[PDB]
mmCIF file of N, CA and C in Angstrom:
data_model
loop_
_atom_site.group_PDB
_atom_site.id
_atom_site.type_symbol
_atom_site.label_atom_id
_atom_site.label_comp_id
_atom_site.label_asym_id
_atom_site.label_seq_id
_atom_site.Cartn_x
_atom_site.Cartn_y
_atom_site.Cartn_z
ATOM 1 N N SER A 1 12.223 -49.285 22.065
ATOM 2 C CA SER A 1 11.583 -49.590 20.711
ATOM 3 C C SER A 1 9.896 -47.639 20.395
ATOM 4 N N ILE A 2 9.852 -48.296 21.908
ATOM 5 C CA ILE A 2 8.614 -47.220 21.918
ATOM 6 C C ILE A 2 8.679 -46.153 21.824
ATOM 7 N N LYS A 3 10.035 -45.369 22.154
ATOM 8 C CA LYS A 3 10.760 -43.816 22.779
ATOM 9 C C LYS A 3 11.144 -44.332 21.232
ATOM 10 N N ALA A 4 11.833 -45.443 20.569
ATOM 11 C CA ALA A 4 12.603 -44.271 18.992
ATOM 12 C C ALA A 4 11.040 -43.834 17.932
ATOM 13 N N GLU A 5 10.365 -44.033 18.649
ATOM 14 C CA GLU A 5 9.122 -43.979 17.660
ATOM 15 C C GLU A 5 8.552 -42.587 18.056
ATOM 16 N N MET A 6 8.754 -42.043 18.986
ATOM 17 C CA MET A 6 8.110 -40.576 19.873
ATOM 18 C C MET A 6 9.199 -39.815 19.938
ATOM 19 N N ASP A 7 10.434 -40.439 19.856
ATOM 20 C CA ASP A 7 11.559 -39.160 19.108
ATOM 21 C C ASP A 7 11.337 -38.501 17.922
ATOM 22 N N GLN A 8 11.313 -39.698 16.769
ATOM 23 C CA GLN A 8 10.799 -38.966 15.933
ATOM 24 C C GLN A 8 9.217 -38.290 15.433
ATOM 25 N N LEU A 9 8.657 -38.499 16.337
ATOM 26 C CA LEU A 9 7.295 -38.235 15.545
ATOM 27 C C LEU A 9 7.354 -36.518 16.672
ATOM 28 N N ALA A 10 8.606 -36.164 17.487
ATOM 29 C CA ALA A 10 8.912 -34.759 18.170
ATOM 30 C C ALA A 10 9.164 -34.074 17.672
ATOM 31 N N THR A 11 10.527 -34.990 16.247
ATOM 32 C CA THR A 11 11.072 -33.952 15.148
ATOM 33 C C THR A 11 10.693 -33.076 14.127
ATOM 34 N N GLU A 12 8.893 -33.857 13.784
ATOM 35 C CA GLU A 12 8.191 -33.597 13.013
ATOM 36 C C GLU A 12 7.534 -31.914 13.040
ATOM 37 N N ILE A 13 7.411 -31.803 14.541
ATOM 38 C CA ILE A 13 6.753 -31.393 15.555
ATOM 39 C C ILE A 13 7.672 -29.999 15.184
ATOM 40 N N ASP A 14 8.625 -29.971 14.554
ATOM 41 C CA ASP A 14 10.134 -29.396 15.488
ATOM 42 C C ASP A 14 9.932 -29.150 13.799
ATOM 43 N N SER A 15 9.891 -29.501 13.242
ATOM 44 C CA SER A 15 9.992 -29.590 11.549
ATOM 45 C C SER A 15 8.856 -28.789 10.666
ATOM 46 N N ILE A 16 7.734 -29.302 11.130
ATOM 47 C CA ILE A 16 6.611 -28.506 10.725
ATOM 48 C C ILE A 16 6.838 -26.743 11.054
ATOM 49 N N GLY A 17 7.186 -26.762 12.563
ATOM 50 C CA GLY A 17 7.351 -24.813 12.951
ATOM 51 C C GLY A 17 8.165 -24.290 12.297
ATOM 52 N N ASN A 18 9.080 -24.524 12.087
ATOM 53 C CA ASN A 18 10.538 -24.137 11.146
ATOM 54 C C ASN A 18 10.016 -24.171 9.827
ATOM 55 N N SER A 19 9.267 -24.417 9.321
ATOM 56 C CA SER A 19 9.575 -24.931 7.672
ATOM 57 C C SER A 19 8.303 -23.899 7.142
ATOM 58 N N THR A 20 6.697 -23.821 8.175
ATOM 59 C CA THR A 20 5.637 -23.126 7.309
ATOM 60 C C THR A 20 5.512 -21.514 7.363
ATOM 61 N N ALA A 21 5.271 -21.399 5.325
ATOM 62 C CA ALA A 21 5.964 -19.913 5.916
ATOM 63 C C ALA A 21 4.801 -19.974 4.406
ATOM 64 N N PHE A 22 4.816 -18.302 4.220
ATOM 65 C CA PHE A 22 4.015 -17.758 2.823
ATOM 66 C C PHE A 22 5.189 -17.112 2.325
ATOM 67 N N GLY A 23 5.537 -17.914 1.052
ATOM 68 C CA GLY A 23 6.428 -17.810 -0.028
ATOM 69 C C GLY A 23 7.785 -17.726 1.109
ATOM 70 N N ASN A 24 7.670 -17.028 1.534
ATOM 71 C CA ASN A 24 9.609 -16.582 1.917
ATOM 72 C C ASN A 24 9.371 -16.615 3.348
ATOM 73 N N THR A 25 8.202 -16.185 4.720
ATOM 74 C CA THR A 25 8.356 -15.254 5.226
ATOM 75 C C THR A 25 7.354 -16.481 6.436
ATOM 76 N N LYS A 26 8.845 -17.107 7.362
ATOM 77 C CA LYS A 26 7.821 -18.053 8.258
ATOM 78 C C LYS A 26 6.870 -17.693 9.227
ATOM 79 N N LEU A 27 5.430 -18.243 9.522
ATOM 80 C CA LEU A 27 4.462 -18.308 9.888
ATOM 81 C C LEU A 27 4.519 -18.486 11.797
ATOM 82 N N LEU A 28 5.791 -19.434 11.778
ATOM 83 C CA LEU A 28 5.313 -20.279 13.241
ATOM 84 C C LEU A 28 6.703 -20.251 14.486
ATOM 85 N N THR A 29 7.592 -19.433 13.567
ATOM 86 C CA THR A 29 9.201 -18.930 14.479
ATOM 87 C C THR A 29 8.920 -17.993 15.931
ATOM 88 N N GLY A 30 7.482 -17.209 15.530
ATOM 89 C CA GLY A 30 6.989 -16.107 16.591
ATOM 90 C C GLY A 30 7.171 -14.391 16.061
ATOM 91 N N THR A 31 7.317 -14.860 14.505
ATOM 92 C CA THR A 31 7.832 -13.300 14.494
ATOM 93 C C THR A 31 6.154 -13.190 13.612
ATOM 94 N N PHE A 32 5.352 -13.263 14.465
ATOM 95 C CA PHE A 32 3.919 -12.548 14.650
ATOM 96 C C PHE A 32 3.819 -12.979 15.529
ATOM 97 N N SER A 33 4.396 -12.943 16.931
ATOM 98 C CA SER A 33 4.399 -12.816 18.038
ATOM 99 C C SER A 33 3.749 -12.350 18.821
ATOM 100 N N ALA A 34 3.820 -10.654 18.248
ATOM 101 C CA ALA A 34 3.177 -9.427 18.266
ATOM 102 C C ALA A 34 2.602 -8.948 17.242
ATOM 103 N N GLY A 35 1.234 -9.275 16.687
ATOM 104 C CA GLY A 35 0.799 -9.279 15.712
ATOM 105 C C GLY A 35 0.316 -8.243 14.859
ATOM 106 N N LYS A 36 1.202 -8.803 13.735
ATOM 107 C CA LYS A 36 0.949 -7.779 12.983
ATOM 108 C C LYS A 36 0.063 -7.010 11.790
ATOM 109 N N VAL A 37 -0.255 -5.911 11.656
ATOM 110 C CA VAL A 37 -0.903 -5.175 10.823
ATOM 111 C C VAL A 37 -1.671 -5.368 9.842
ATOM 112 N N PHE A 38 -2.707 -5.371 9.297
ATOM 113 C CA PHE A 38 -3.029 -5.140 7.858
ATOM 114 C C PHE A 38 -4.646 -4.015 7.790
ATOM 115 N N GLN A 39 -4.314 -2.641 6.847
ATOM 116 C CA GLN A 39 -5.298 -2.138 7.112
ATOM 117 C C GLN A 39 -6.271 -2.212 6.009
ATOM 118 N N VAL A 40 -7.624 -1.921 6.280
ATOM 119 C CA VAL A 40 -8.526 -2.619 5.310
ATOM 120 C C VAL A 40 -9.641 -1.288 5.089
ATOM 121 N N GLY A 41 -9.255 -0.058 5.439
ATOM 122 C CA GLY A 41 -10.108 0.911 5.552
ATOM 123 C C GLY A 41 -9.403 2.558 4.026
ATOM 124 N N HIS A 42 -9.706 3.393 4.400
ATOM 125 C CA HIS A 42 -9.040 3.728 3.413
ATOM 126 C C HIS A 42 -8.786 4.863 4.239
ATOM 127 N N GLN A 43 -8.785 5.812 6.085
ATOM 128 C CA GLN A 43 -8.027 5.822 6.603
ATOM 129 C C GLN A 43 -6.772 5.105 7.998
ATOM 130 N N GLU A 44 -6.465 6.580 8.318
ATOM 131 C CA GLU A 44 -5.272 6.080 8.981
ATOM 132 C C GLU A 44 -6.377 5.365 10.422
ATOM 133 N N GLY A 45 -5.690 4.144 11.383
ATOM 134 C CA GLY A 45 -6.310 3.325 12.325
ATOM 135 C C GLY A 45 -7.554 2.419 11.844
ATOM 136 N N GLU A 46 -7.604 1.816 10.601
ATOM 137 C CA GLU A 46 -8.757 1.035 10.294
ATOM 138 C C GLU A 46 -7.974 -0.192 9.828
ATOM 139 N N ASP A 47 -7.463 -0.417 11.499
ATOM 140 C CA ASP A 47 -6.395 -1.673 11.444
ATOM 141 C C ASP A 47 -6.808 -3.105 11.911
ATOM 142 N N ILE A 48 -6.449 -4.125 10.834
ATOM 143 C CA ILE A 48 -6.315 -5.921 11.841
ATOM 144 C C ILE A 48 -5.276 -6.340 12.067
ATOM 145 N N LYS A 49 -5.445 -7.096 13.305
ATOM 146 C CA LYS A 49 -4.246 -7.765 14.028
ATOM 147 C C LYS A 49 -4.139 -9.070 13.709
ATOM 148 N N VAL A 50 -3.335 -9.710 13.572
ATOM 149 C CA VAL A 50 -3.827 -10.867 13.794
ATOM 150 C C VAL A 50 -2.270 -12.048 14.809
ATOM 151 N N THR A 51 -2.478 -12.272 15.296
ATOM 152 C CA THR A 51 -1.139 -12.234 16.412
ATOM 153 C C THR A 51 -1.380 -14.000 15.918
ATOM 154 N N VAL A 52 -0.318 -14.917 16.413
ATOM 155 C CA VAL A 52 0.265 -16.667 15.750
ATOM 156 C C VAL A 52 1.543 -16.807 16.656
ATOM 157 N N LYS A 53 1.349 -17.094 18.180
ATOM 158 C CA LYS A 53 2.203 -17.375 19.104
ATOM 159 C C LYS A 53 3.549 -19.140 18.503
ATOM 160 N N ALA A 54 4.301 -18.571 18.588
ATOM 161 C CA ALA A 54 5.295 -19.473 18.039
ATOM 162 C C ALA A 54 4.904 -21.053 19.066
ATOM 163 N N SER A 55 5.315 -22.418 17.389
ATOM 164 C CA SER A 55 4.264 -23.261 18.094
ATOM 165 C C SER A 55 5.467 -24.767 17.741
ATOM 166 N N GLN B 1 -14.137 53.855 -27.659
ATOM 167 C CA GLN B 1 -14.390 52.991 -27.223
ATOM 168 C C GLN B 1 -14.822 51.770 -27.470
ATOM 169 N N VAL B 2 -15.360 52.451 -29.033
ATOM 170 C CA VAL B 2 -16.249 50.963 -29.517
ATOM 171 C C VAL B 2 -13.665 50.414 -30.220
ATOM 172 N N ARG B 3 -13.426 50.584 -30.800
ATOM 173 C CA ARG B 3 -12.163 50.112 -30.263
ATOM 174 C C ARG B 3 -11.229 49.265 -29.134
ATOM 175 N N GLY B 4 -11.627 50.220 -27.981
ATOM 176 C CA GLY B 4 -10.964 50.481 -27.206
ATOM 177 C C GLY B 4 -11.463 48.499 -26.471
ATOM 178 N N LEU B 5 -12.695 48.894 -26.732
ATOM 179 C CA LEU B 5 -13.383 47.326 -26.373
ATOM 180 C C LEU B 5 -13.179 45.461 -27.003
ATOM 181 N N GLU B 6 -13.078 46.588 -28.706
ATOM 182 C CA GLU B 6 -11.854 45.336 -28.783
ATOM 183 C C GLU B 6 -10.989 45.029 -28.870
ATOM 184 N N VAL B 7 -10.046 45.889 -28.478
ATOM 185 C CA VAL B 7 -8.485 45.053 -27.817
ATOM 186 C C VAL B 7 -9.119 44.644 -26.764
ATOM 187 N N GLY B 8 -10.049 45.023 -26.130
ATOM 188 C CA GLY B 8 -10.134 44.869 -24.626
ATOM 189 C C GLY B 8 -10.457 42.770 -24.767
ATOM 190 N N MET B 9 -11.484 42.935 -25.960
ATOM 191 C CA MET B 9 -11.838 41.531 -25.796
ATOM 192 C C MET B 9 -10.863 40.809 -26.175
ATOM 193 N N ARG B 10 -9.580 40.821 -26.906
ATOM 194 C CA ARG B 10 -8.571 39.798 -27.765
ATOM 195 C C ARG B 10 -7.606 39.966 -25.676
ATOM 196 N N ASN B 11 -8.079 40.653 -25.219
ATOM 197 C CA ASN B 11 -7.025 40.957 -23.675
ATOM 198 C C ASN B 11 -7.589 39.915 -23.135
ATOM 199 N N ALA B 12 -8.831 40.045 -22.486
ATOM 200 C CA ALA B 12 -9.862 38.505 -21.987
ATOM 201 C C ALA B 12 -9.246 37.057 -22.966
ATOM 202 N N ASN B 13 -9.484 37.227 -24.244
ATOM 203 C CA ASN B 13 -9.580 35.996 -24.116
ATOM 204 C C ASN B 13 -7.921 34.764 -24.368
ATOM 205 N N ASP B 14 -6.868 35.765 -23.876
ATOM 206 C CA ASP B 14 -5.694 36.244 -23.703
ATOM 207 C C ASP B 14 -5.687 34.741 -21.643
ATOM 208 N N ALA B 15 -6.062 35.830 -21.581
ATOM 209 C CA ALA B 15 -6.257 35.251 -20.084
ATOM 210 C C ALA B 15 -6.743 34.156 -19.562
ATOM 211 N N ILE B 16 -7.638 33.560 -20.426
ATOM 212 C CA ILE B 16 -8.385 32.559 -20.761
ATOM 213 C C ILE B 16 -7.928 31.399 -21.248
ATOM 214 N N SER B 17 -7.637 31.612 -21.641
ATOM 215 C CA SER B 17 -6.256 30.344 -22.025
ATOM 216 C C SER B 17 -5.296 30.002 -21.151
ATOM 217 N N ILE B 18 -4.215 30.962 -19.912
ATOM 218 C CA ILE B 18 -3.726 30.976 -19.327
ATOM 219 C C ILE B 18 -3.687 30.375 -18.641
ATOM 220 N N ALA B 19 -5.471 30.325 -17.774
ATOM 221 C CA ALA B 19 -6.349 29.783 -17.108
ATOM 222 C C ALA B 19 -6.663 28.609 -16.835
ATOM 223 N N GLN B 20 -6.956 27.330 -18.627
ATOM 224 C CA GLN B 20 -7.424 26.441 -19.111
ATOM 225 C C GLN B 20 -6.152 25.569 -19.362
ATOM 226 N N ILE B 21 -4.915 26.875 -19.659
ATOM 227 C CA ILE B 21 -3.694 25.738 -19.629
ATOM 228 C C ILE B 21 -3.518 24.955 -18.465
ATOM 229 N N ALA B 22 -3.440 26.051 -16.908
ATOM 230 C CA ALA B 22 -2.925 26.045 -15.398
ATOM 231 C C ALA B 22 -3.777 24.556 -15.925
ATOM 232 N N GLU B 23 -5.066 24.617 -15.433
ATOM 233 C CA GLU B 23 -5.605 23.882 -15.264
ATOM 234 C C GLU B 23 -5.772 22.298 -15.820
ATOM 235 N N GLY B 24 -5.568 22.395 -16.632
ATOM 236 C CA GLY B 24 -5.058 20.865 -18.128
ATOM 237 C C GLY B 24 -4.190 20.265 -16.757
ATOM 238 N N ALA B 25 -2.739 20.887 -16.802
ATOM 239 C CA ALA B 25 -2.360 20.402 -15.648
ATOM 240 C C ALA B 25 -1.758 19.811 -14.591
ATOM 241 N N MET B 26 -2.694 20.479 -13.852
ATOM 242 C CA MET B 26 -3.209 19.965 -12.348
ATOM 243 C C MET B 26 -4.355 18.429 -12.193
ATOM 244 N N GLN B 27 -4.711 18.756 -13.648
ATOM 245 C CA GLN B 27 -5.746 17.542 -13.628
ATOM 246 C C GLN B 27 -4.668 16.338 -13.124
ATOM 247 N N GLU B 28 -3.473 15.501 -14.001
ATOM 248 C CA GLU B 28 -2.847 14.671 -14.180
ATOM 249 C C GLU B 28 -2.188 14.787 -12.941
ATOM 250 N N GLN B 29 -1.710 16.129 -12.394
ATOM 251 C CA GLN B 29 -0.657 15.876 -11.310
ATOM 252 C C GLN B 29 -2.275 15.060 -10.029
ATOM 253 N N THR B 30 -3.143 15.489 -10.170
ATOM 254 C CA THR B 30 -4.315 14.799 -9.177
ATOM 255 C C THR B 30 -4.363 13.311 -9.640
ATOM 256 N N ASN B 31 -4.299 12.831 -10.719
ATOM 257 C CA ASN B 31 -4.262 11.629 -10.711
ATOM 258 C C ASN B 31 -3.204 10.872 -10.613
ATOM 259 N N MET B 32 -1.698 11.132 -10.518
ATOM 260 C CA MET B 32 -0.496 10.172 -10.111
ATOM 261 C C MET B 32 -0.522 11.042 -8.539
ATOM 262 N N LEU B 33 -1.336 11.786 -7.802
ATOM 263 C CA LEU B 33 -1.203 11.579 -6.579
ATOM 264 C C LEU B 33 -1.929 10.530 -5.585
ATOM 265 N N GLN B 34 -3.395 10.092 -6.582
ATOM 266 C CA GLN B 34 -4.316 8.781 -5.909
ATOM 267 C C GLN B 34 -3.709 7.220 -5.796
ATOM 268 N N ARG B 35 -2.579 7.262 -7.069
ATOM 269 C CA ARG B 35 -2.178 6.405 -7.426
ATOM 270 C C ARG B 35 -0.742 6.469 -6.058
ATOM 271 N N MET B 36 -0.248 7.372 -5.186
ATOM 272 C CA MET B 36 0.553 7.306 -4.815
ATOM 273 C C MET B 36 -0.321 7.187 -2.982
ATOM 274 N N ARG B 37 -1.734 7.595 -2.633
ATOM 275 C CA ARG B 37 -2.102 6.569 -1.937
ATOM 276 C C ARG B 37 -2.284 4.926 -2.399
ATOM 277 N N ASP B 38 -3.166 4.693 -2.842
ATOM 278 C CA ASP B 38 -3.265 3.594 -3.370
ATOM 279 C C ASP B 38 -1.252 2.709 -3.035
ATOM 280 N N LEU B 39 -0.535 2.801 -3.175
ATOM 281 C CA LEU B 39 0.669 2.501 -2.818
ATOM 282 C C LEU B 39 1.107 2.056 -1.655
ATOM 283 N N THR B 40 0.534 3.023 -0.655
ATOM 284 C CA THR B 40 0.940 3.447 0.761
ATOM 285 C C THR B 40 -0.187 2.941 1.560
ATOM 286 N N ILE B 41 -1.353 3.076 0.992
ATOM 287 C CA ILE B 41 -2.087 1.510 1.942
ATOM 288 C C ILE B 41 -1.358 0.027 1.375
ATOM 289 N N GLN B 42 -1.217 -0.038 -0.343
ATOM 290 C CA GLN B 42 -0.097 -1.365 -0.637
ATOM 291 C C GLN B 42 0.434 -1.476 0.317
ATOM 292 N N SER B 43 2.008 -0.601 1.081
ATOM 293 C CA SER B 43 2.342 -1.022 1.456
ATOM 294 C C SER B 43 2.175 -1.462 2.967
ATOM 295 N N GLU B 44 1.652 -1.904 3.478
ATOM 296 C CA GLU B 44 0.923 -1.424 5.201
ATOM 297 C C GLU B 44 0.968 -2.756 5.286
ATOM 298 N N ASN B 45 1.061 -4.384 4.716
ATOM 299 C CA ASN B 45 0.881 -5.388 4.997
ATOM 300 C C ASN B 45 1.207 -6.157 6.050
ATOM 301 N N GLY B 46 1.155 -7.291 6.183
ATOM 302 C CA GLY B 46 2.547 -8.151 6.981
ATOM 303 C C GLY B 46 2.674 -8.917 6.468
ATOM 304 N N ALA B 47 2.529 -9.383 5.077
ATOM 305 C CA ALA B 47 2.647 -10.080 4.595
ATOM 306 C C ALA B 47 4.229 -10.383 3.394
ATOM 307 N N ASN B 48 4.193 -8.655 3.657
ATOM 308 C CA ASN B 48 5.041 -7.952 2.206
ATOM 309 C C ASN B 48 6.977 -8.362 3.075
ATOM 310 N N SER B 49 8.020 -7.761 2.696
ATOM 311 C CA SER B 49 8.684 -8.508 3.558
ATOM 312 C C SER B 49 10.007 -7.109 3.124
ATOM 313 N N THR B 50 11.141 -7.015 3.614
ATOM 314 C CA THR B 50 12.074 -5.520 3.733
ATOM 315 C C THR B 50 12.431 -5.421 2.231
ATOM 316 N N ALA B 51 12.466 -6.524 1.271
ATOM 317 C CA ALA B 51 12.360 -6.550 -0.162
ATOM 318 C C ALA B 51 11.644 -5.775 -1.396
ATOM 319 N N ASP B 52 10.303 -6.154 -0.388
ATOM 320 C CA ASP B 52 9.149 -5.763 -0.934
ATOM 321 C C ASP B 52 8.832 -4.164 -0.767
ATOM 322 N N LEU B 53 8.861 -4.275 -0.194
ATOM 323 C CA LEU B 53 8.436 -2.261 -0.328
ATOM 324 C C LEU B 53 10.080 -0.687 -0.504
ATOM 325 N N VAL B 54 11.335 -1.852 -0.557
ATOM 326 C CA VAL B 54 11.901 -1.453 -1.594
ATOM 327 C C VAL B 54 11.161 -1.083 -2.888
#
């Protein structure tokens, strides 16, 4: 009976990982494993990198 | 000389008008080029998608 409870809790850790999205882009499934780039200046090279490992 | 200058005056007023029109058109090309710069900066989000870039 205790395992039947642990088993379902692990299913949601999977479910949150595969659901969390920004409109339509999944953020916790490794597409941000190699940090993506945002440009915050007005010239080339002024970038910020955000890395989210798969969980 | 008197009549020669009078025709010469109108000759230069014509050149002023040509330079005036060309300068006016290049101003509008400059504004649209600035908008292209913003779109290139805007197109660098990491939250965009393949359909968004199109």
